Design a protein around this nucleic acid. Structure first.
Length: 69
RNA sequence: GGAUUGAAACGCCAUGCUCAGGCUGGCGAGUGGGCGCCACUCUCCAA
């Protein structure tokens, strides 16, 4: 009908929670705002809007720690 | 061609495991035992 299905994957990710920003801690899954951000990176013009509907999670949850200057 | 609580963000500069110490002193392969018993070169061939 209309709308699209897109797949994305990678090895690292960090969607920082607003209330633990100085010491970054990530959500368990990507919030809709990040999805908004990614789609606009392929094509976007001032004349249109993006509307997100769903997200599918296909892997288990894992965590790791890193420190930097 | 606005805005992924985002856009930028070195763990970095440098320091001897060093100085020295005996595997030593010493102890019998040593005591002793028959190669023995006995047996035909012997029968015949002109120079």
């Amino acid at each position: 009908t209309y709308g699209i299905r897109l797949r994305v994957w990678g090895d690292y990710a960090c969607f920082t929670r607003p209330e633990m920003k100085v010491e970054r801690v990530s959500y368990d899954v990507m919030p809709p705002s990040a999805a908004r951000g990614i789609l606009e990176a392929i094509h976007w013009k001032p004349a249109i809007r993006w509307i997100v509907d769903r997200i599918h999670v296909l892997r288990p949850i894992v965590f790791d720690n890193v420190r930097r200057n």
